[PDB]
Amino acid sequence: KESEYAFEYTACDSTGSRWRVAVPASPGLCTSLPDPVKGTECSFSCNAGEFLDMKDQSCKPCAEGRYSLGTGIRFDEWDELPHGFASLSANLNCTSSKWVPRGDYIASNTDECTATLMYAVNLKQSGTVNFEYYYPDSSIIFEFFVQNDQCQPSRWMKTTEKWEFHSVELNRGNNVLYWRTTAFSVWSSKPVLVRNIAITGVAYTSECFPCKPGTYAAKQGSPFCKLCPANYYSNKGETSCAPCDADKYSEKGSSTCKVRPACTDKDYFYTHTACDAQGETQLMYKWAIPKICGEDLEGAVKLPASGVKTRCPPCNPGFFKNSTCEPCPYGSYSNGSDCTHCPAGTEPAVGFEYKWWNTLPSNMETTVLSGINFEYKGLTGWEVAGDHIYTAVGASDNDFMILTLVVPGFRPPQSVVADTENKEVARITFVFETICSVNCELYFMVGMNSRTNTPVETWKGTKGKQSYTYTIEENATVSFTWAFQRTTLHETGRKYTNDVAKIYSINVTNVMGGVASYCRPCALECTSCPAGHYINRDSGTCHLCPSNTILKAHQPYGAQACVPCGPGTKNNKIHSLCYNDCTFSRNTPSRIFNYNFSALAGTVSLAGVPSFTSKGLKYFHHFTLSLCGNQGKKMAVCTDNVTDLKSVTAYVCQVVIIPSEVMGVSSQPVSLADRLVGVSTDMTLEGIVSPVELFHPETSGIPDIVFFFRSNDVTQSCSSGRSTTIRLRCNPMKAAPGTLRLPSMCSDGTCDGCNFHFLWESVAACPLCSASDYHTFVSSCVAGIQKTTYMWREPKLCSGGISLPEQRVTIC
Amino acid sequence: KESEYAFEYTACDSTGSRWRVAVPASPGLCTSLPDPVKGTECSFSCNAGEFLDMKDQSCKPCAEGRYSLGTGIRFDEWDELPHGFASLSANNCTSSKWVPRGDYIASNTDECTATLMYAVNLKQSGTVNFEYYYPDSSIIFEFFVQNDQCQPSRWMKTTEKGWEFHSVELNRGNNVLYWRTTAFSVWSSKPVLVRNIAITGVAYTSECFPCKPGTYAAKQGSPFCKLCPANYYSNKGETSCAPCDADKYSEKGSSTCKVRPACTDKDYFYTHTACDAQGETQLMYKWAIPKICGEDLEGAVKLPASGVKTRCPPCNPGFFKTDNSTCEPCPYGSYSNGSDCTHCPAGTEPAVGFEYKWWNTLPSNMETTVLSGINFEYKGLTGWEVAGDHIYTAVGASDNDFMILTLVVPGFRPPQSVVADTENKEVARITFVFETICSVNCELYFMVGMNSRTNTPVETWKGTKGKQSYTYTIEENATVSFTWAFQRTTLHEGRKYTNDVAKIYSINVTNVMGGVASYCRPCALECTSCPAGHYINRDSGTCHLCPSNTILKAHQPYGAQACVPCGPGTKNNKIHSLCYNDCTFSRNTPSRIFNYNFSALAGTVSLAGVPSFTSKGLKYFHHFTLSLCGNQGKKMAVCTDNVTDLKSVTAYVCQVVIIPSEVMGYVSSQPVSLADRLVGVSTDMTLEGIVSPVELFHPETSGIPDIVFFFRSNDVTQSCSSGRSTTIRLRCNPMKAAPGTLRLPSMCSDGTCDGCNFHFLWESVAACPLCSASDYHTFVSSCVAGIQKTTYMWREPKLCSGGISLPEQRVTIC
Ligand SMILES: *[C@@H]1O[C@H](CO)[C@@H](O[C@@H]2O[C@H](CO)[C@@H](O)[C@H](O)[C@H]2NC(C)=O)[C@H](O)[C@H]1NC(C)=O
Ligand SMILES: *[C@@H]1O[C@H](CO)[C@@H](O[C@@H]2O[C@H](CO)[C@@H](O)[C@H](O)[C@H]2NC(C)=O)[C@H](O)[C@H]1NC(C)=O
Ligand SMILES: *[C@@H]1O[C@H](CO)[C@@H](O[C@@H]2O[C@H](CO)[C@@H](O)[C@H](O)[C@H]2NC(C)=O)[C@H](O)[C@H]1NC(C)=O
Ligand SMILES: *[C@@H]1O[C@H](CO)[C@@H](O[C@@H]2O[C@H](CO)[C@@H](O)[C@H](O)[C@H]2NC(C)=O)[C@H](O)[C@H]1NC(C)=O
Ligand SMILES: *[C@@H]1O[C@H](CO)[C@@H](O)[C@H](O)[C@H]1NC(C)=O
Ligand SMILES: *[C@@H]1O[C@H](CO)[C@@H](O)[C@H](O)[C@H]1NC(C)=O
Ligand SMILES: *[C@@H]1O[C@H](CO)[C@@H](O)[C@H](O)[C@H]1NC(C)=O
Ligand SMILES: *[C@@H]1O[C@H](CO)[C@@H](O)[C@H](O)[C@H]1NC(C)=O
Ligand SMILES: *[C@@H]1O[C@H](CO)[C@@H](O)[C@H](O)[C@H]1NC(C)=O
Ligand SMILES: *[C@@H]1O[C@H](CO)[C@@H](O)[C@H](O)[C@H]1NC(C)=O
């Protein structure tokens, strides 16, 4: 009978010809089977419609509700590591540092060691791989490279903004696919996620299986089932999703519905309503937008009563108070009642200040990022609360409630733009309060002119009413973004909605089209004064500051603007920065010394002792120094290779250097020195202490010249900012370029954590040979010959300077 | 009909079950086919008993004369790189890939990577059985298999005695096989040969092919049909080889016979017969023993008339002539001039050792063997034949053959005086006349293997040469295998270079147990081991110490003239064996005498030259180890090659070549002794023939003379006629550190501008003179206010160090 036997192909011959043969279902069931007929030759791939019915030698689209795959394999569902996938970790213990199958997505390794996801496939015909990856953090470096059958080697992968797609072509011989991640770029993470692997060409033939539960395929020949929309039921092989009951809610593509939970107080978030014509703002309560709980269920608190009328907060400085806050014309400043017009002489202030929150300003945008799938829903991430701006309730406790301030351009004040040495284009601040309990991370990422976001700061744990001042270094459309995460733990539901960050105000200066609250008093032509000219509002004229004083371009107001230079330094031509001509001059009561470091003016470098990490990676820092001369311009420029695969101008710079062998390599450039506090023989100067105990005691006994630097930047670890001292030591035998030495007891660079103390032993640091630093030996006359000749002192500590006088002979 | 259809297997299912189905030969030929029947599941490999007919499920032995292969694949014919084999070469090395020479494949001689890659989809677990030849150790040959995940006993043994067999297990995954050879061990080659690759487990099933022509399989189910023996005819599929005609000869495993060529005069090699009882030998002619030519063919010269009676050469020194005219050693304790060995007095001593000058027959220790150039196997029949005055180099099977002569010594007895001194490295020597008459591309080899160890080529001569010699000094008592190998040419082609013949006129070896004597040494009477450093006079009969500044030569401690005065600046040690320098020189000028003291420089110091690249991608930088003075003048620089472990020479200066560790993956080799004696220490630039040029190094600013330590090496090589001479120049630098700075000449970075002399320069403060009592300033001061201050102060242009202390200041009232 026709139903008794099922047709079947024969084994391929040398020529590739094949035979289609009827075989009984039971071994030796019956006789009188149909004769064999030839068939296609191993290339019958129908590309996701391949039912490949044996009865008809053609590709017939198969029944609805059945994922047909294709001539390939899909790896969507990563409950565990799918069969054949190898997760290997190697150290250059990382047993736990393998690609963890978190769920529908697999995650990378955060620590600094290799983690390879290996798949070796016998791709019978040429095909492709379509791994869809998420690459947020540039710390981990992520590459995908395929080896041929001979195990022979565009591997490096792009950083992702906004899940990203990729495709690579494959040949027919035993391709092996590597997904490798090593977190060695920064040494400072955030894992890398890949999902939906799609190899093609594996099988030459496939049969369409019933569609997996929780998915539907209404149209026949569907390459893959459509994932079921939320709150809908779906069984395996169903033509379309069946809507679920009201009392039961199902997640996106969930086969089994679950009872809607009882509502709690944690599901609320309170907002201030927009001010009406009456001007009485009312507190309002709104349920979470992805609501899943049921209010009708017993034990669930109803929506709390809201609508208490209270006076609106006054309009922000720069907006004129229909009670709606809107900007008032430029050239005027507002205290809140009404913006008063400025005189022509006084200067308006450009920039945006956001203190009182009645509604999100125009540049403000708020978006939500999910922690389970990492897509930007963007419903409402931060809500206004009048005094502060709240952090709303997300879909889940892992959500990144993202607030973004985007400012297009910064108008530099005329005085600041005049000095090229000044690096400030404008600055931002905040009051990043928190009331967090555990495992939260407030991020403050800055992205200029559509460049990739780089996290300027990342606060963690509970904090207090604080602040932050980032100095923008370039004119660009910046995207100031603040990201709050309730918890790093992955758990179903909302738990830490009470752990709310707050931003009481975000003041930004020097913004084109900005409003003003300060009406700057400037000297009448105000106008750009010539370089290095102080400004008096009443004088209306530009005058040069007195010698040994440097004008601060930030606030060139009054004659008090420019500050006297520190000891041992002289002001440059622009009168902008105190610098040191390469000569120092120390005077003792017996004699006055004189030095000259013009041989040390060139930039010098030093690398610390390579110190291994907790993992197998070893790190050694690199410091670049500029000391004296060259009009006191910062000659040490220090960059970061790793991004290319920032640039800071400073007198001393530190860059971490990952070993070149590991990468197959600089990182974290910082400016250890941005000013010259002073040059003096004293150990302490203006709060910077250079410990004499760190270095070896000086044998000569003459004082050691100490250069006292200081850095402007204030970080989380450094309260007052980095302060570096370069100690100069007189050493006649050592080379003129000298030897640069970090302290012995701490080799990483800062056993204090913020102060980098150096030591420069050279002959240039030795005092200039004075006219009294030699021997006088007088002989009256021996046989009527006066021999008074002058010799250098063998305990020589001087170099250069005056020459030996010629021997003196004069008969008595 | 049964002949109309042939059964066949169906495609394997998920469960592994399979169906056997009869299919008509023609498409739709006829109906009424037999029903399917279940067949074998997955692997059913019969492993060379596999015919696997469809009628019977069991594997059957296929017909005779047919190789059944196995469940794998056999690669045997490398006329071209077989399909699937990849020959990838990386550092032009495009030509430096594995060349398919013929039945065997060869490696790359130059110094760059050459990989033979084969990637196989091994369905079931199996093995790879590659038979390889690894003569030279300069190339390093690795065989390592990568699994399906491309994941990594890689290094392979050296081969002697011919060809060796290796097997490695394999897995089910797609396995790729690497045969990699890089010639980066010694930098000084000889290729590496592999044959008969035999993968198993590839296909789960094979069909019984007919056996290739030129081979036979008489027994059914033969795993591989045997190669046809020589001079026999064989066609494909024949049950057994058919003997070939007399007129046509066929090589081993040759399907088609070839007519025997006409004989030429080049096929002869002449020999001297053994000395008969009459005592008159005769020249004899024997045809080339693997004869392939025909004498009956026209144009071929017959065997030359031989048998001219001439007197046998006299017996070698140490063998007594017999009435039977046969040479045989005579009793120990006597020396022979040839007529008869005269008994020696107890006061004189026999000389242990073997001398071979006159060739009537191969002595007992001699063996001669032939190595073929086509199959590299030791036929061993007769390579070198005797010719009276010289030992000939007879004709091999082919024109690429290695006619190998071997000398074997049981062990060497050190003379009592020599063994007394541990510093002496002499255990035995050797010598030869190594004439040649070669035309092109020959290579006389001299390899030495002691105590049955592996053979290392001590020397390798090439091209035409003349009557010469060589004196290798054996470094240890052992069983040595002195081997000579002569190759007619490197070109692979018949024989045409029978005229170009190496000859060895004499092979003298000293200090051999059971050895015969021709010199009857004179010792002083109790000859017994004299106390260390005692000269010997045969008439005196007493051991006396040599006078100071003289060192006794342990090789020839005869007479009072044995010990030679030491060179300038040196003093003899306690043993009076070697001149050494206590770390102090003393140069005197007419104005003042200097005094140095180098005790800070006694420790061994090292230096590496500037890394210089090869013509290929490899770069080499040398490593020199120096020992200068003190420590009783014992050679503190021991230098050894790493790579052989993956020799050790004691010398004052040693050069070793450091191949970079990155290339090897972990490497120093070619050690040599640049200095074995101290000729003398002097401020003169030339001393006893060693010249240390002043132009090489920068001129001295101080102006005081620079000491030039004058060394010298005993070894004489092909490149160095007189032996390497190294001079260490010491320069006074007050600023330089006490260990000092060591610098090679700037003109030649490799180390030697000349090619044999290594001049160094050591700048340090230790080389500076000791501060003399006259190397400072005296400054008399007449009493000013009745105060005299004649204080003493060092000279500002200081060039001294250490020495006398600066005197205290003077204060005396006038
Ligand atoms: C520091 O020493 C230098 C060298 O003696 C002084 O002289 C200058 O040297 C530089 C090269 O280093 C030359 O280019 C200048 O022409 C030299 N003269 C001057 C006036 O600069 C140098 O003057 C010393 N420093 C000071 C401040 O006097
Ligand atoms: C990254 O950039 C730095 C320079 O900023 C490079 O550093 C040099 O590396 C070489 C090789 O080790 C050293 O010889 C130099 O002394 C280094 N100079 C400095 C200033 O660091 C480094 O090579 C770059 N990394 C790359 C190209 O991978
Ligand atoms: C050269 O210098 C070394 C040390 O710098 C001297 O060595 C001393 O030798 C005496 C005996 O002669 C010992 O008692 C001392 O203990 C040695 N010194 C040290 C530090 O161990 C040596 O004498 C000097 N002169 C010569 C010719 O070698
Ligand atoms: C080959 O041998 C030489 C000396 O026998 C080794 O040279 C020293 O190796 C150590 C460790 O590798 C280094 O720290 C030294 O700097 C090397 N030189 C000296 C003078 O000590 C060499 O390492 C050996 N190479 C290998 C691969 O074993
Ligand atoms: C180190 O390896 C051992 C395996 O012996 C493992 O038990 C341990 O957890 C590893 N260390 C860490 C920090 O995981
Ligand atoms: C930011 O604060 C400064 C503090 O002096 C103030 O002058 C400035 O006006 C503020 N920014 C704006 C845009 O108002
Ligand atoms: C620089 O500032 C101007 C003025 O705000 C702005 O229009 C421009 O886009 C900025 N430069 C860039 C981002 O190229
Ligand atoms: C360099 O390689 C080329 C192949 O591109 C080859 O033709 C040439 O002979 C090589 N050079 C030498 C010196 O062999
Ligand atoms: C080797 O040559 C030397 C030459 O001095 C000779 O005295 C000695 O007898 C020779 N060897 C033998 C074993 O005769
Ligand atoms: C050393 O020489 C003796 C001489 O009789 C010999 O028997 C012995 O085998 C030699 N040493 C070795 C290790 O073979």
PDB file of N, CA, C and O in Angstrom, chain A residues 9 11 19 21 23 120 122 147 149-151 174 178 775 777-780 789 794, chain B residues 9 11 19 21 23 33 121 146 148-150 174 178 779-782 791 793-794:
ATOM      1  N   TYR A   9      15.923   8.385  -0.259  1.00  0.00           N
ATOM      2  CA  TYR A   9      17.086   8.528  -1.119  1.00  0.00           C
ATOM      3  C   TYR A   9      18.128   7.459  -0.814  1.00  0.00           C
ATOM      4  O   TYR A   9      18.142   6.861   0.267  1.00  0.00           O
ATOM      5  N   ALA A  11      22.448   6.380  -0.933  1.00  0.00           N
ATOM      6  CA  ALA A  11      23.735   7.010  -0.679  1.00  0.00           C
ATOM      7  C   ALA A  11      24.325   7.555  -1.973  1.00  0.00           C
ATOM      8  O   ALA A  11      24.221   6.933  -3.033  1.00  0.00           O
ATOM      9  N   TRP A  19      19.442   7.776  -6.080  1.00  0.00           N
ATOM     10  CA  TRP A  19      18.256   7.004  -6.418  1.00  0.00           C
ATOM     11  C   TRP A  19      17.216   7.178  -5.323  1.00  0.00           C
ATOM     12  O   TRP A  19      17.547   7.137  -4.134  1.00  0.00           O
ATOM     13  N   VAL A  21      14.059   5.615  -3.538  1.00  0.00           N
ATOM     14  CA  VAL A  21      13.627   4.234  -3.372  1.00  0.00           C
ATOM     15  C   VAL A  21      12.547   4.148  -2.303  1.00  0.00           C
ATOM     16  O   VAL A  21      12.668   4.754  -1.233  1.00  0.00           O
ATOM     17  N   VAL A  23      10.792   2.167   0.617  1.00  0.00           N
ATOM     18  CA  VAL A  23      11.141   1.179   1.629  1.00  0.00           C
ATOM     19  C   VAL A  23       9.928   0.989   2.530  1.00  0.00           C
ATOM     20  O   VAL A  23       9.280   1.972   2.892  1.00  0.00           O
ATOM     21  N   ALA A 120      32.742  24.721  15.653  1.00  0.00           N
ATOM     22  CA  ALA A 120      33.312  24.108  14.460  1.00  0.00           C
ATOM     23  C   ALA A 120      32.200  23.403  13.699  1.00  0.00           C
ATOM     24  O   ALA A 120      31.577  22.477  14.227  1.00  0.00           O
ATOM     25  N   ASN A 122      30.826  21.674   9.905  1.00  0.00           N
ATOM     26  CA  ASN A 122      31.148  21.087   8.604  1.00  0.00           C
ATOM     27  C   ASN A 122      30.179  21.655   7.578  1.00  0.00           C
ATOM     28  O   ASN A 122      29.223  21.000   7.163  1.00  0.00           O
ATOM     29  N   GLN A 147      38.368  30.356  10.872  1.00  0.00           N
ATOM     30  CA  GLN A 147      39.497  29.611  10.336  1.00  0.00           C
ATOM     31  C   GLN A 147      39.010  28.565   9.343  1.00  0.00           C
ATOM     32  O   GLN A 147      37.950  27.962   9.528  1.00  0.00           O
ATOM     33  N   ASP A 149      39.571  25.045   6.739  1.00  0.00           N
ATOM     34  CA  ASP A 149      39.858  23.646   7.045  1.00  0.00           C
ATOM     35  C   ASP A 149      41.323  23.452   7.409  1.00  0.00           C
ATOM     36  O   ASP A 149      41.657  22.612   8.253  1.00  0.00           O
ATOM     37  N   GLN A 150      42.213  24.218   6.786  1.00  0.00           N
ATOM     38  CA  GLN A 150      43.636  24.170   7.094  1.00  0.00           C
ATOM     39  C   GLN A 150      43.990  24.933   8.365  1.00  0.00           C
ATOM     40  O   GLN A 150      45.177  25.174   8.611  1.00  0.00           O
ATOM     41  N   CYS A 151      42.992  25.312   9.166  1.00  0.00           N
ATOM     42  CA  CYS A 151      43.204  26.068  10.401  1.00  0.00           C
ATOM     43  C   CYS A 151      44.016  27.335  10.138  1.00  0.00           C
ATOM     44  O   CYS A 151      44.909  27.699  10.906  1.00  0.00           O
ATOM     45  N   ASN A 174      34.937  22.683   6.661  1.00  0.00           N
ATOM     46  CA  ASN A 174      35.081  22.616   8.116  1.00  0.00           C
ATOM     47  C   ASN A 174      35.439  23.949   8.763  1.00  0.00           C
ATOM     48  O   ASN A 174      36.504  24.081   9.373  1.00  0.00           O
ATOM     49  N   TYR A 178      35.224  31.673  15.894  1.00  0.00           N
ATOM     50  CA  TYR A 178      35.674  32.133  17.201  1.00  0.00           C
ATOM     51  C   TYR A 178      34.988  33.449  17.533  1.00  0.00           C
ATOM     52  O   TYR A 178      35.009  34.384  16.729  1.00  0.00           O
ATOM     53  N   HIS A 775      90.242  76.276  44.856  1.00  0.00           N
ATOM     54  CA  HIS A 775      91.297  76.414  45.852  1.00  0.00           C
ATOM     55  C   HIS A 775      92.237  77.541  45.456  1.00  0.00           C
ATOM     56  O   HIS A 775      92.596  77.674  44.282  1.00  0.00           O
ATOM     57  N   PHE A 777      96.045  78.656  46.435  1.00  0.00           N
ATOM     58  CA  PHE A 777      97.264  78.164  47.067  1.00  0.00           C
ATOM     59  C   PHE A 777      98.385  79.127  46.711  1.00  0.00           C
ATOM     60  O   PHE A 777      98.827  79.170  45.560  1.00  0.00           O
ATOM     61  N   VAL A 778      98.846  79.889  47.698  1.00  0.00           N
ATOM     62  CA  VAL A 778      99.808  80.960  47.481  1.00  0.00           C
ATOM     63  C   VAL A 778     101.166  80.523  48.012  1.00  0.00           C
ATOM     64  O   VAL A 778     101.277  80.012  49.134  1.00  0.00           O
ATOM     65  N   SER A 779     102.190  80.673  47.178  1.00  0.00           N
ATOM     66  CA  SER A 779     103.582  80.513  47.571  1.00  0.00           C
ATOM     67  C   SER A 779     104.282  81.839  47.312  1.00  0.00           C
ATOM     68  O   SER A 779     104.218  82.362  46.194  1.00  0.00           O
ATOM     69  N   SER A 780     104.930  82.387  48.340  1.00  0.00           N
ATOM     70  CA  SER A 780     105.535  83.706  48.203  1.00  0.00           C
ATOM     71  C   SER A 780     106.607  83.689  47.121  1.00  0.00           C
ATOM     72  O   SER A 780     106.410  84.263  46.048  1.00  0.00           O
ATOM     73  N   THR A 789      98.816  78.945  41.837  1.00  0.00           N
ATOM     74  CA  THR A 789      97.970  78.379  40.799  1.00  0.00           C
ATOM     75  C   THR A 789      96.699  77.826  41.429  1.00  0.00           C
ATOM     76  O   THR A 789      96.711  77.367  42.576  1.00  0.00           O
ATOM     77  N   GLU A 794      88.485  68.808  44.450  1.00  0.00           N
ATOM     78  CA  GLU A 794      88.172  67.415  44.138  1.00  0.00           C
ATOM     79  C   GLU A 794      86.797  66.984  44.634  1.00  0.00           C
ATOM     80  O   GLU A 794      86.122  66.236  43.906  1.00  0.00           O
TER      81      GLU A 794
ATOM     82  N   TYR B   9      23.402   0.665  -0.978  1.00  0.00           N
ATOM     83  CA  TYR B   9      22.987   1.116   0.340  1.00  0.00           C
ATOM     84  C   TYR B   9      22.210   2.422   0.241  1.00  0.00           C
ATOM     85  O   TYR B   9      22.429   3.235  -0.661  1.00  0.00           O
ATOM     86  N   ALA B  11      20.824   6.102   2.110  1.00  0.00           N
ATOM     87  CA  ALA B  11      21.416   7.138   2.943  1.00  0.00           C
ATOM     88  C   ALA B  11      21.143   6.852   4.413  1.00  0.00           C
ATOM     89  O   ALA B  11      20.053   6.409   4.784  1.00  0.00           O
ATOM     90  N   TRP B  19      19.449   0.658   4.663  1.00  0.00           N
ATOM     91  CA  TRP B  19      18.662  -0.255   3.851  1.00  0.00           C
ATOM     92  C   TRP B  19      19.450  -0.615   2.598  1.00  0.00           C
ATOM     93  O   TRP B  19      20.037   0.261   1.955  1.00  0.00           O
ATOM     94  N   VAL B  21      19.273  -1.862  -1.175  1.00  0.00           N
ATOM     95  CA  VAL B  21      18.271  -1.798  -2.231  1.00  0.00           C
ATOM     96  C   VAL B  21      18.923  -2.133  -3.563  1.00  0.00           C
ATOM     97  O   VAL B  21      20.003  -1.621  -3.878  1.00  0.00           O
ATOM     98  N   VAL B  23      19.095  -1.645  -7.451  1.00  0.00           N
ATOM     99  CA  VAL B  23      18.745  -0.613  -8.422  1.00  0.00           C
ATOM    100  C   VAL B  23      19.163  -1.094  -9.808  1.00  0.00           C
ATOM    101  O   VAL B  23      20.270  -1.629  -9.968  1.00  0.00           O
ATOM    102  N   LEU B  33      11.971  -5.843  -8.889  1.00  0.00           N
ATOM    103  CA  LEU B  33      13.230  -5.846  -8.165  1.00  0.00           C
ATOM    104  C   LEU B  33      13.049  -6.464  -6.780  1.00  0.00           C
ATOM    105  O   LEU B  33      11.956  -6.425  -6.210  1.00  0.00           O
ATOM    106  N   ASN B 121      38.991  14.358   6.927  1.00  0.00           N
ATOM    107  CA  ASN B 121      37.746  14.154   7.668  1.00  0.00           C
ATOM    108  C   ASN B 121      37.685  12.694   8.092  1.00  0.00           C
ATOM    109  O   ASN B 121      37.040  11.864   7.453  1.00  0.00           O
ATOM    110  N   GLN B 146      46.275  18.872  14.763  1.00  0.00           N
ATOM    111  CA  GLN B 146      45.283  19.767  15.338  1.00  0.00           C
ATOM    112  C   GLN B 146      43.894  19.157  15.205  1.00  0.00           C
ATOM    113  O   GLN B 146      43.545  18.603  14.159  1.00  0.00           O
ATOM    114  N   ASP B 148      39.501  19.171  15.643  1.00  0.00           N
ATOM    115  CA  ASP B 148      38.467  19.923  14.937  1.00  0.00           C
ATOM    116  C   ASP B 148      38.424  21.373  15.401  1.00  0.00           C
ATOM    117  O   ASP B 148      38.195  22.284  14.598  1.00  0.00           O
ATOM    118  N   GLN B 149      38.643  21.608  16.690  1.00  0.00           N
ATOM    119  CA  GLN B 149      38.681  22.954  17.246  1.00  0.00           C
ATOM    120  C   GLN B 149      39.975  23.693  16.921  1.00  0.00           C
ATOM    121  O   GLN B 149      40.226  24.750  17.510  1.00  0.00           O
ATOM    122  N   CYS B 150      40.791  23.161  16.009  1.00  0.00           N
ATOM    123  CA  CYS B 150      42.079  23.753  15.650  1.00  0.00           C
ATOM    124  C   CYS B 150      42.947  23.967  16.888  1.00  0.00           C
ATOM    125  O   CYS B 150      43.616  24.991  17.037  1.00  0.00           O
ATOM    126  N   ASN B 174      37.635  16.534  12.411  1.00  0.00           N
ATOM    127  CA  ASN B 174      38.422  16.888  11.238  1.00  0.00           C
ATOM    128  C   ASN B 174      39.850  17.207  11.664  1.00  0.00           C
ATOM    129  O   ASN B 174      40.107  18.256  12.263  1.00  0.00           O
ATOM    130  N   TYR B 178      50.407  18.380  10.327  1.00  0.00           N
ATOM    131  CA  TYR B 178      51.492  19.279   9.959  1.00  0.00           C
ATOM    132  C   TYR B 178      52.807  18.515   9.978  1.00  0.00           C
ATOM    133  O   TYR B 178      53.150  17.891  10.987  1.00  0.00           O
ATOM    134  N   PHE B 779     102.371  71.363  46.589  1.00  0.00           N
ATOM    135  CA  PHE B 779     102.157  72.807  46.559  1.00  0.00           C
ATOM    136  C   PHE B 779     102.767  73.402  47.819  1.00  0.00           C
ATOM    137  O   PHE B 779     102.091  73.538  48.842  1.00  0.00           O
ATOM    138  N   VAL B 780     104.041  73.753  47.738  1.00  0.00           N
ATOM    139  CA  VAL B 780     104.719  74.412  48.844  1.00  0.00           C
ATOM    140  C   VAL B 780     104.179  75.829  48.984  1.00  0.00           C
ATOM    141  O   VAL B 780     103.871  76.505  47.995  1.00  0.00           O
ATOM    142  N   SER B 781     104.029  76.273  50.228  1.00  0.00           N
ATOM    143  CA  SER B 781     103.528  77.609  50.533  1.00  0.00           C
ATOM    144  C   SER B 781     104.442  78.228  51.578  1.00  0.00           C
ATOM    145  O   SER B 781     104.523  77.732  52.707  1.00  0.00           O
ATOM    146  N   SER B 782     105.131  79.303  51.205  1.00  0.00           N
ATOM    147  CA  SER B 782     105.964  80.017  52.161  1.00  0.00           C
ATOM    148  C   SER B 782     105.098  80.581  53.279  1.00  0.00           C
ATOM    149  O   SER B 782     103.948  80.971  53.057  1.00  0.00           O
ATOM    150  N   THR B 791      99.969  71.595  51.556  1.00  0.00           N
ATOM    151  CA  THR B 791      98.982  70.532  51.455  1.00  0.00           C
ATOM    152  C   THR B 791      99.090  69.844  50.103  1.00  0.00           C
ATOM    153  O   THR B 791      99.469  70.461  49.103  1.00  0.00           O
ATOM    154  N   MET B 793      97.459  67.543  46.984  1.00  0.00           N
ATOM    155  CA  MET B 793      96.182  67.488  46.293  1.00  0.00           C
ATOM    156  C   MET B 793      96.311  66.604  45.062  1.00  0.00           C
ATOM    157  O   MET B 793      97.306  66.683  44.337  1.00  0.00           O
ATOM    158  N   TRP B 794      95.305  65.763  44.828  1.00  0.00           N
ATOM    159  CA  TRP B 794      95.314  64.900  43.655  1.00  0.00           C
ATOM    160  C   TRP B 794      95.331  65.734  42.381  1.00  0.00           C
ATOM    161  O   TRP B 794      94.875  66.878  42.355  1.00  0.00           O
TER     162      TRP B 794
END
